[PDB]
Coordinates of C-alpha atoms in Angstrom, one line a residue:
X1 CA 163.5 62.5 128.7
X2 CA 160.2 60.8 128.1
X3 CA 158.2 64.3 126.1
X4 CA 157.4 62.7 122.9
X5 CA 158.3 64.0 119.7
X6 CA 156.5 64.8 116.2
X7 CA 156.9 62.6 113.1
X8 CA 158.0 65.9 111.4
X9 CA 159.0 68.4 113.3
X10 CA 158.2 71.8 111.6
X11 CA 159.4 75.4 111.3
X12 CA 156.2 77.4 112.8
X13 CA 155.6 81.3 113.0
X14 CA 153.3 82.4 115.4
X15 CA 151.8 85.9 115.0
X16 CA 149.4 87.6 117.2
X17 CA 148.7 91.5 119.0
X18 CA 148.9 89.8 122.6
X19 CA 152.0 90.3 125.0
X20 CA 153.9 87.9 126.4
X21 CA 153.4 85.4 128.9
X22 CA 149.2 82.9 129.6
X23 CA 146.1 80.4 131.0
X24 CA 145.8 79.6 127.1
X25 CA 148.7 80.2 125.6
X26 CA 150.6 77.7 126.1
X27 CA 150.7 75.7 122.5
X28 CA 153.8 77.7 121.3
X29 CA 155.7 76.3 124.1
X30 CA 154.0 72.7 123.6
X31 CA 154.8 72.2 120.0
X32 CA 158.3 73.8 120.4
X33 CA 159.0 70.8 123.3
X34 CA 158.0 68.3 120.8
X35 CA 160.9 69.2 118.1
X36 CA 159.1 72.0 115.9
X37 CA 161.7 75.1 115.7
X38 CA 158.8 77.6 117.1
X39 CA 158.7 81.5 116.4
X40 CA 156.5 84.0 117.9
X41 CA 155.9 87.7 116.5
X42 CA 154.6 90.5 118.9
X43 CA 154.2 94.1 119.0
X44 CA 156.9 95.8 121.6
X45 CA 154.6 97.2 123.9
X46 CA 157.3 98.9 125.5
X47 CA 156.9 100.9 128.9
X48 CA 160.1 103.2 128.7
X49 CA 163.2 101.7 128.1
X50 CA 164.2 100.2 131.0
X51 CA 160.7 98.0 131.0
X52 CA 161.2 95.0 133.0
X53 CA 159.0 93.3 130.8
X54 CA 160.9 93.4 128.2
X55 CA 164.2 93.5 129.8
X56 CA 165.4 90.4 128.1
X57 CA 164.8 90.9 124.9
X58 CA 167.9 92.3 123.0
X59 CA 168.1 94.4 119.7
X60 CA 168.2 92.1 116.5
X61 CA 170.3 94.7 115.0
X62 CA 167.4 94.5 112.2
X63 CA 165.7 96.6 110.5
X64 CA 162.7 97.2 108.3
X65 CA 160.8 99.9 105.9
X66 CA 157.8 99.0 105.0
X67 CA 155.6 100.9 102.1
X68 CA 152.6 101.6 103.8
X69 CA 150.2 104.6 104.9
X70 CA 151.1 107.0 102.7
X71 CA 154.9 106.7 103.0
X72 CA 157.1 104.4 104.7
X73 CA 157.9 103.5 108.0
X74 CA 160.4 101.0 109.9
X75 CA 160.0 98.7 112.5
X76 CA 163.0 96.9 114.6
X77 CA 163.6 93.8 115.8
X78 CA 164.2 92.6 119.1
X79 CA 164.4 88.9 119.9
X80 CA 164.7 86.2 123.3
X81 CA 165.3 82.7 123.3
X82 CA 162.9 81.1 126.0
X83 CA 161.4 77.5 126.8
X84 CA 163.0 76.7 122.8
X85 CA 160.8 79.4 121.7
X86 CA 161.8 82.6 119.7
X87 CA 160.0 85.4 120.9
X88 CA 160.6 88.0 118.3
X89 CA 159.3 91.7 118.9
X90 CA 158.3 93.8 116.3
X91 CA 159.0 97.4 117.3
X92 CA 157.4 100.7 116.5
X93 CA 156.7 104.3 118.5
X94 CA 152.7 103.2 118.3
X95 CA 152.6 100.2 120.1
X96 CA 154.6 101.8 123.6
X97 CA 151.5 103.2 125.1
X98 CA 149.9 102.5 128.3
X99 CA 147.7 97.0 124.8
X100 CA 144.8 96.7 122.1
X101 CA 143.1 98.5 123.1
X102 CA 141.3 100.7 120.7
X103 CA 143.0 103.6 119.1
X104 CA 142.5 105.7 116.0
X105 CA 145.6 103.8 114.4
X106 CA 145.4 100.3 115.1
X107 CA 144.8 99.9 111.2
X108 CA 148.1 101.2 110.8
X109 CA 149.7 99.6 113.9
X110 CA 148.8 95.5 112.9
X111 CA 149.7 96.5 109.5
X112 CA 153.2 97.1 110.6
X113 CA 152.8 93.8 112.7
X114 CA 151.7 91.7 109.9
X115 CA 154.8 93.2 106.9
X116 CA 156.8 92.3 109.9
X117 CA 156.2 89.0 110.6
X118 CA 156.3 88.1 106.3
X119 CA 160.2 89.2 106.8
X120 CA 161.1 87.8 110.5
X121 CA 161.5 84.5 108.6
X122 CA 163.9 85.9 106.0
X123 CA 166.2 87.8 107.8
X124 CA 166.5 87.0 111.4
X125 CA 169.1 84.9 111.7
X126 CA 168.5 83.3 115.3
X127 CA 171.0 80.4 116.5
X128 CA 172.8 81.3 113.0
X129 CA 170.2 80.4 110.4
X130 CA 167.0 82.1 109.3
X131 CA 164.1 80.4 109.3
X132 CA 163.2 80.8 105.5
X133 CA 160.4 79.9 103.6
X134 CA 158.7 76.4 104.6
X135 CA 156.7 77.8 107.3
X136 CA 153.6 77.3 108.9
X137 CA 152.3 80.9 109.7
X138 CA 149.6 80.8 112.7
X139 CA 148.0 84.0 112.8
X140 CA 145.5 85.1 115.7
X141 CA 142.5 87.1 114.9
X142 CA 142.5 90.2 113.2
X143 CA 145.2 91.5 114.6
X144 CA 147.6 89.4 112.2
X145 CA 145.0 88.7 109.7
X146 CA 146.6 90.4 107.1
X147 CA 149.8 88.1 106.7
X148 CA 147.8 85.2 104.8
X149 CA 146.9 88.1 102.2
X150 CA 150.6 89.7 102.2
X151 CA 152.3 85.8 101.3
X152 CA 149.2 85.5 98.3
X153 CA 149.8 89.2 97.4
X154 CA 153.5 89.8 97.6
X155 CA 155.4 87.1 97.7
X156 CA 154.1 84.0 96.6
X157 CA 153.3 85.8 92.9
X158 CA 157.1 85.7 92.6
X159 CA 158.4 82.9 93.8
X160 CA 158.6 83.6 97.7
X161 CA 156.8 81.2 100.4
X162 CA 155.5 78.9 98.0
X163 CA 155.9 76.1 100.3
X164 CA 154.4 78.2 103.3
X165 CA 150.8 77.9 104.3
X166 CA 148.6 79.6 107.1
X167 CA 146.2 78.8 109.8
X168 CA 143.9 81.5 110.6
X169 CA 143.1 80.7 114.4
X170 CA 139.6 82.9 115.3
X171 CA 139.1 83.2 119.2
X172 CA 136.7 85.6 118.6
X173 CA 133.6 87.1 115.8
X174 CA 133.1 90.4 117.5
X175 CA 136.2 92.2 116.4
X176 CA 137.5 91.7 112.7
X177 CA 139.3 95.0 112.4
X178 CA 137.1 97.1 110.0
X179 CA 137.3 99.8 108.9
X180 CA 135.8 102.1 105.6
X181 CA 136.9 101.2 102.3
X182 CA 138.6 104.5 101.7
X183 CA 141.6 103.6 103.5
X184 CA 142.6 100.0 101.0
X185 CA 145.2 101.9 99.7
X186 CA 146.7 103.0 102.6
X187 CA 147.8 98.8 103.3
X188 CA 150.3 99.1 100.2
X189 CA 148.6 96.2 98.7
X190 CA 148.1 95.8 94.7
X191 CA 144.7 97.0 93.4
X192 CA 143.6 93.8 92.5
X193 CA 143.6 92.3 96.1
X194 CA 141.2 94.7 97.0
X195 CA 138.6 92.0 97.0
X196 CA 140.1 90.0 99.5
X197 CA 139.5 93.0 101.6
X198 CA 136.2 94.3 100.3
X199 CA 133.1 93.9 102.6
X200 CA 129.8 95.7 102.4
X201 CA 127.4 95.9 105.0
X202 CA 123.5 95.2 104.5
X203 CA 121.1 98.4 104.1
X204 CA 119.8 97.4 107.7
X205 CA 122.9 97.7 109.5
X206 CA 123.3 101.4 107.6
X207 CA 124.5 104.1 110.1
X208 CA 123.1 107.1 107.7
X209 CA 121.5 108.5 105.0
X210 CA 124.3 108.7 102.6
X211 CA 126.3 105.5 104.2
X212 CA 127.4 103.1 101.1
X213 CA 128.6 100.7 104.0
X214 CA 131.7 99.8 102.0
X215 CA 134.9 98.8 104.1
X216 CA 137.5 96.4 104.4
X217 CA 138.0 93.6 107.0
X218 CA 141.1 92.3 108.1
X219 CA 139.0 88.9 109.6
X220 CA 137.4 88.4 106.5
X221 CA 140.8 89.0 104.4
X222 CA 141.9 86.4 106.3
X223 CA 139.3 84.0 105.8
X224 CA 139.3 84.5 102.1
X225 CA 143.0 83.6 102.1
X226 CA 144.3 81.1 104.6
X227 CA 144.9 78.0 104.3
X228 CA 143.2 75.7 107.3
X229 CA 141.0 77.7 109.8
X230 CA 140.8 76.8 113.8
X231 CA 137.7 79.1 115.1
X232 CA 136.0 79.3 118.2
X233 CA 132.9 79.0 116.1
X234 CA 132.9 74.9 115.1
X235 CA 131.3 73.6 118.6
X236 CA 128.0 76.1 118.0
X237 CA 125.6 76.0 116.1
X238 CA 124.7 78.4 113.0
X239 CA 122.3 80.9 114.8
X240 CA 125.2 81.3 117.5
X241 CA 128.2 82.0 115.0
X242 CA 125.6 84.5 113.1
X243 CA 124.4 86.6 116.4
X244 CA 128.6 86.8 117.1
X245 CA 130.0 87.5 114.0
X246 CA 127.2 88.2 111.7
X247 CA 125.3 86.0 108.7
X248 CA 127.6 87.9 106.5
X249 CA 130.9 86.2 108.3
X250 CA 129.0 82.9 109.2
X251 CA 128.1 82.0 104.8
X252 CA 132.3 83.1 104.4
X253 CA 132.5 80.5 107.2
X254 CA 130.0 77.7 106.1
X255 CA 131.5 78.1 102.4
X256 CA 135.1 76.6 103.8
X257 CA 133.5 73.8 105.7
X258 CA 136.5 71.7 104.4
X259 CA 139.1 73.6 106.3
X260 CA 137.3 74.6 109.6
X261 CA 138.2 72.8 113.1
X262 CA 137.2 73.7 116.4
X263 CA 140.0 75.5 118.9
X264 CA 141.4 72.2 121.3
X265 CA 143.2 73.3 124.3
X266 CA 145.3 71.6 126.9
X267 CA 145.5 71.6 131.0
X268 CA 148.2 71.1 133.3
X269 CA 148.0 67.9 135.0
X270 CA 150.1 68.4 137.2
X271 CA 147.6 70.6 139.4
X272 CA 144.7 68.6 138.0
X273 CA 145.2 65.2 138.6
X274 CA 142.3 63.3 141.1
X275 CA 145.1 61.1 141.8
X276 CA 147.4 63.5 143.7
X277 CA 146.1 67.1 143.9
X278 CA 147.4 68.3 147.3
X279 CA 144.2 70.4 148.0
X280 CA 141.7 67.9 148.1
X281 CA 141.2 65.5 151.5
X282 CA 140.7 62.4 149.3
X283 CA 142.8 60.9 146.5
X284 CA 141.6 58.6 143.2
X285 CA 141.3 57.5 140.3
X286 CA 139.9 55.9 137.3
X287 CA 140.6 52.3 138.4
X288 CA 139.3 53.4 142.1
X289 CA 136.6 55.3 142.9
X290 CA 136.0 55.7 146.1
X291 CA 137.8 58.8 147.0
X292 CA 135.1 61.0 144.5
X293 CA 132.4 59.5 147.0
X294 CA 134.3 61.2 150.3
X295 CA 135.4 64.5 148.8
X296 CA 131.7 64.6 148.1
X297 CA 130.8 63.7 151.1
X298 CA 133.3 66.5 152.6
X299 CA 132.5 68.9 150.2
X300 CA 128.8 68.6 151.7
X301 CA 130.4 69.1 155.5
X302 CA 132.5 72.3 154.2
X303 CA 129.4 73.9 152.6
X304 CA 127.4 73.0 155.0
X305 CA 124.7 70.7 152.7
X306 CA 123.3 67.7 153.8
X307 CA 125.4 64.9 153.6
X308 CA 123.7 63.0 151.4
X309 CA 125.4 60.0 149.1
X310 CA 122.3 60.1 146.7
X311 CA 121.7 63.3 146.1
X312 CA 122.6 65.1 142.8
X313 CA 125.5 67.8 143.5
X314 CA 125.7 70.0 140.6
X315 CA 128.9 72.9 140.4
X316 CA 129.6 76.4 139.0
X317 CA 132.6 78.2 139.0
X318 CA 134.3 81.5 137.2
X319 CA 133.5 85.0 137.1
X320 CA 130.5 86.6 137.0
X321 CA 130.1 87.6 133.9
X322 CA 127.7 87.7 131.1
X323 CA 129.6 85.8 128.6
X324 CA 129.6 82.9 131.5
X325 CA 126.2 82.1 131.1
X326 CA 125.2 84.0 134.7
X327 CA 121.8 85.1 133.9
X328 CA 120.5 81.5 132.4
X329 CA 121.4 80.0 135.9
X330 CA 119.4 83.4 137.5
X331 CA 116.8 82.6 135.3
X332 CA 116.8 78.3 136.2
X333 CA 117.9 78.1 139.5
X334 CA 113.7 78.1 140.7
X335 CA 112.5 75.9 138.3
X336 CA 115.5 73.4 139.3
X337 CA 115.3 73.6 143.2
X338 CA 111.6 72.3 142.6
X339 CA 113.6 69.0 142.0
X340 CA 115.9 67.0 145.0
X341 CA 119.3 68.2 143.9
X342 CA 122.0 70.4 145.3
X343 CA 123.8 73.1 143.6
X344 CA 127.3 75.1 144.8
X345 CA 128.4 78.0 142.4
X346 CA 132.0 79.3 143.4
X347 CA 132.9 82.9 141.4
X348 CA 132.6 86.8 141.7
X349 CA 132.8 90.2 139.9
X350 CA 129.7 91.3 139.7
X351 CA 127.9 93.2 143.2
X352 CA 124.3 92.9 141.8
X353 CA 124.7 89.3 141.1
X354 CA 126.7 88.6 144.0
X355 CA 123.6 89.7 146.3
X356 CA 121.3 87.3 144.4
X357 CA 123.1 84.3 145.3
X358 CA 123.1 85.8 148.9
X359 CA 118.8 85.8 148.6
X360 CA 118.8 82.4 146.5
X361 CA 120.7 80.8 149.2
X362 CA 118.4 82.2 152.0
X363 CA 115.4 81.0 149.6
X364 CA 116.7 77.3 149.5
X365 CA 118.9 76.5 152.4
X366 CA 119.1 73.2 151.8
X367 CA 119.8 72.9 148.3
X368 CA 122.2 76.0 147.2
X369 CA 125.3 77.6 148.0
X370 CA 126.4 80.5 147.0
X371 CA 130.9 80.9 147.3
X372 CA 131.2 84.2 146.6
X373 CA 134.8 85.6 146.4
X374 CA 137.6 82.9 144.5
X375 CA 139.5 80.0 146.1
X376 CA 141.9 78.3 143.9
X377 CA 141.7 75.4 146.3
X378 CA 138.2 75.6 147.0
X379 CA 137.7 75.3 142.9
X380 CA 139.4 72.1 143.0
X381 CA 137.1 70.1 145.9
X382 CA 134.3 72.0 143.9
X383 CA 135.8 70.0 140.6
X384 CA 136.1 66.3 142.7
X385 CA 133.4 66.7 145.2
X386 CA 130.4 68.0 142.5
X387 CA 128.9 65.0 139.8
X388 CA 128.1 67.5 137.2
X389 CA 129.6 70.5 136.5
X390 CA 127.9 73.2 134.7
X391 CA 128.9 75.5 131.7
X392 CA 126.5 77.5 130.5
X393 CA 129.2 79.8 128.3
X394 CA 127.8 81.6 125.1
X395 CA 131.1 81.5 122.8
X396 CA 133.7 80.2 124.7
X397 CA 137.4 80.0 123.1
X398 CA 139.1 79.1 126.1
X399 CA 136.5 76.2 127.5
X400 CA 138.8 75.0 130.0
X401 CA 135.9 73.4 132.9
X402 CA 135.2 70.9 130.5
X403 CA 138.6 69.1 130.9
X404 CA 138.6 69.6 134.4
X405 CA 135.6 67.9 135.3
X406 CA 136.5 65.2 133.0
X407 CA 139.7 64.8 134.3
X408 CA 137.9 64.8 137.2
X409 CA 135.0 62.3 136.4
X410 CA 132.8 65.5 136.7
X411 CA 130.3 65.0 134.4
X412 CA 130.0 68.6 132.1
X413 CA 126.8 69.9 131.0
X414 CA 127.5 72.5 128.9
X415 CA 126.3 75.0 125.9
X416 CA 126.9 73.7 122.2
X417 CA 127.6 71.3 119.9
X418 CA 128.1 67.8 120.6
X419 CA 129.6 65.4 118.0
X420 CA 132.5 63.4 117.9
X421 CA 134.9 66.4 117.0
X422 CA 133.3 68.2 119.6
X423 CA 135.2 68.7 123.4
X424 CA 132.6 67.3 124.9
X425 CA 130.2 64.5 122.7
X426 CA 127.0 64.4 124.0
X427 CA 125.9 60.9 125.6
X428 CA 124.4 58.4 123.7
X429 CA 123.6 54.9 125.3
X430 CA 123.4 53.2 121.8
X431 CA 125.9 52.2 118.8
X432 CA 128.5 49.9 117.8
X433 CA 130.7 49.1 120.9
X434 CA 127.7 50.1 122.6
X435 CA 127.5 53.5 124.9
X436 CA 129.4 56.7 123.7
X437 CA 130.3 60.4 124.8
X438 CA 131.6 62.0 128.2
X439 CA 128.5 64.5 129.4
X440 CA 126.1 66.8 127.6
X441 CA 126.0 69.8 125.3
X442 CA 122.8 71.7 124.4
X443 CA 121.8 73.6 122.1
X444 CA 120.6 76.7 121.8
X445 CA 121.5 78.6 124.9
X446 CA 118.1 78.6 126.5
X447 CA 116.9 77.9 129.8
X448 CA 114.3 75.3 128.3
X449 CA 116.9 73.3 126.9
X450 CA 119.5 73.8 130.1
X451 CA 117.3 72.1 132.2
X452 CA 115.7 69.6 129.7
X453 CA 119.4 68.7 129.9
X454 CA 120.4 68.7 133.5
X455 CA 117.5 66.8 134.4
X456 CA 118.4 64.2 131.6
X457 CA 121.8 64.3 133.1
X458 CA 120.0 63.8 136.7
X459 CA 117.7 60.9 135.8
X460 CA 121.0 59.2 134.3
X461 CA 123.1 59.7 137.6
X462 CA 119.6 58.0 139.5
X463 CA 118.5 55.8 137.8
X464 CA 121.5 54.2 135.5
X465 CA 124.7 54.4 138.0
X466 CA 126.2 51.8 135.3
X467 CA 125.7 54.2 132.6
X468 CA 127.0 57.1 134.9
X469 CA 130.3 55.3 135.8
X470 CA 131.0 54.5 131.6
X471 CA 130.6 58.4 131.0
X472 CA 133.0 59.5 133.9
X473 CA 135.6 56.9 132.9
X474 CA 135.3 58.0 129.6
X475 CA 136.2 61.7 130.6
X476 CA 138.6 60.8 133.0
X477 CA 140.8 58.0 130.8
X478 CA 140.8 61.1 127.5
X479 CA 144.1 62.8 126.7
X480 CA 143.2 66.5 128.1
X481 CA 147.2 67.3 128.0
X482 CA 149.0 70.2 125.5
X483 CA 150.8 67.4 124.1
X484 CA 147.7 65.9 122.8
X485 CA 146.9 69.4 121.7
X486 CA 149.6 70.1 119.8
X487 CA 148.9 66.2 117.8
X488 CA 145.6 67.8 116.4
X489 CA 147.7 71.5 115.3
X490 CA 150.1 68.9 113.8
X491 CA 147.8 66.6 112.2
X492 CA 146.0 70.1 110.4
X493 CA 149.4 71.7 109.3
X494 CA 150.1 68.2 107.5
X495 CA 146.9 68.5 105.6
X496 CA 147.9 72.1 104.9
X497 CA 151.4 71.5 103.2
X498 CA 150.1 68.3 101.4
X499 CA 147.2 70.6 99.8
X500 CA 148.1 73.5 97.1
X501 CA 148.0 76.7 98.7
X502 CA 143.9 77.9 98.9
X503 CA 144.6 80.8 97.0
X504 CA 145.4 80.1 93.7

């Protein structure tokens, strides 16, 4: 076939407390298409024995105990073979309940996960031969945060996974599974390692009198010990990462600078392509044009707008939720109808809100419309027919609108960071090979600076058409595919191997 293949393909061990296919989960299957022999560790979350879900996934015939929680307790493994991955499935009585979620003994439940997934590598022998001990690990939040410590605490001291490293991938600050200090030993590690762990709260975030605020934190554990980091945190700025994580997390952070990239995610082109997507009326492309000006131009007639060429038509679309930025476009919306623009948001969950872009609509009837419900293939002439699309998103991990729009020639206006590493680089008319970026990201997430941006992006799409056209060819002609993704993974794991384990 033509799917490209990696320089070095690699032996990678996924580990993570989601259930199997995934709108972001696709780089398992990605890297494993481009040679790598891919493994992914799970918790069973079995629903009885006859769960369809897991219906397919046959009994290892292995076993093991692991030393943990005052005693010791064993966990099976059960295994499929599916789009060249190995889904292996750690099984325990704690994880079949009707996922996370938030339980008394998750401690003790992603402790079991995480001795697991140390030994799937060593024992399972899948296609014949065992994976052994040259392995990326990929852990996902604190969930499997504990591994990176387990290979520095137990094995690599004698011998075992030397020439394995880590990644610590962070989608998310809020939950780094602490817990109080009291229960260290409990995780069957060596005395010494208790550092690694150790974490005290500041006497402001004190929850009583007597409160020492000692605990450990898997997250942290994690960040102290891996080798490369991916975290949601790199596109935001510092006062963002601290109100999500903490100040505490955010200097941990700051003080591995040298190992930190951002998360990069991939789309599937084959339902986003401007150049054949069966739901919209027009079809083009970067070396033509003219088909963004008619779906336009037909997204006007469908919302009922008037159908004007000239006139800025700025999107929305997703749920209506808080961490989607909803109430800064509440808060906006007045001050930006005062200007000649129009402006379609497309999403729903949320009652309240919902009835507010009822009013809005009512209040400006010829500027903004309000699509409440979802329409996959309304979403898509939203994407083509709109010239900006807007993300106001407070910590997004899974920042998919982005490379939509850009695949689209959408310009994206959106909440972060926005340098050259960044998803989207903010535009900037001036520098060697003259104009550079693909839309705009502000920073901080304030209404102020939303619209300072917007109407920069407005007066751009007036007034310099030229420019305009540069920064949606730009977006458009940019590798938004998995395969691309998977490059950047690939390029970090190299720079893993080739450095000495972190800790030492």
């Amino acid at each position: 076939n033509d799917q490209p293949l990696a320089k070095v393909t690699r032996s990678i061990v996924f580990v993570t407390g989601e259930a199997a296919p995934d709108v972001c989960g696709s780089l398992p299957i990605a890297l494993a298409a481009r040679g790598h022999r891919v493994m992914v560790v799970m918790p069973r979350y079995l629903n009885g024995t006859s769960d369809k879900n897991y219906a397919k996934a046959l009994y290892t015939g292995k076993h093991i105990k692991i030393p943990c929680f005052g005693g010791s307790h064993e966990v099976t493994f059960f295994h499929e073979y599916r789009d060249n991955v190995d889904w292996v499935f750690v099984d325990h009585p704690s994880y079949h309940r009707p996922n996370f979620g938030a339980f008394g003994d998750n401690q003790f439940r992603y402790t079991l996960l995480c001795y697991a997934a140390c030994e799937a590598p060593l024992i399972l022998e899948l296609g014949g031969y065992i994976y052994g001990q040259s392995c990326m690990f990929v852990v996902n939040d604190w969930h499997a945060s504990l591994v990176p410590v387990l290979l520095a605490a137990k094995y690599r001291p004698y011998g075992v996974y030397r020439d394995s490293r880590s990644t610590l991938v962070i989608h998310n600050l809020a939950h780094q599974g602490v817990e109080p200090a009291s229960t260290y030993p409990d995780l069957g590690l060596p005395p010494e390692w208790y550092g690694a762990l150790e974490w005290v709260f500041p006497e402001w975030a004190r929850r009583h009198a007597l409160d020492k605020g000692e605990a450990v934190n898997f997250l942290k554990g994690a960040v102290v010990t891996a080798d490369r980091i991916v975290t949601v945190s790199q596109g935001y700025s510092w006062e963002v990462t601290t109100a999500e994580g903490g100040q505490g997390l955010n200097e941990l952070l700051s003080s591995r600078k040298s190992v930190l990239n951002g998360i990069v995610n991939g789309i599937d082109i084959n339902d986003w392509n401007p150049t054949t997507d069966k739901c919209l009326p027009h079809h083009y492309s970067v070396d033509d044009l003219s088909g963004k000006a008619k779906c336009k131009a037909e997204l006007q007639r469908e919302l009922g707008l008037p159908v004007r060429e000239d006139v800025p038509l700025i999107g929305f679309i997703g749920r209506l939720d808080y961490q989607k930025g909803i109430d800064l476009i509440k808060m906006a919306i007045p001050d930006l109808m005062r200007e000649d623009v129009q402006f379609v948001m497309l999403g729903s969950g949320d009652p309240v809100f919902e009835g507010w872009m009822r009013s809005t609509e009512s209040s400006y009837k010829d500027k903004f419309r309000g699509w409440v419900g979802f329409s996959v293939p309304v979403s898509h002439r939203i994407t083509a027919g709109c010239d900006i699309l807007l993300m106001p998103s407070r910590f997004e991990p899974c920042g998919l609108n982005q490379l939509y729009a850009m695949q689209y020639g959408t310009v994206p206006v959106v909440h972060g960071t926005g340098g050259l590493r960044d998803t989207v680089e903010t535009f900037n008319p001036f520098g060697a090979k003259g104009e550079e970026g693909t839309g705009w990201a502000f920073s901080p997430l304030t209404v102020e600076k939303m619209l300072w941006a917007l109407r920069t992006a407005i007066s751009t799409f007036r007034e310099h058409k030229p420019s305009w056209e540069g920064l949606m060819k730009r977006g458009m002609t940019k590798d938004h595919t998995w395969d691309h993704a998977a490059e950047q993974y690939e390029q970090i794991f190299e720079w893993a191997f080739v450095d000495q384990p972190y800790v030492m």
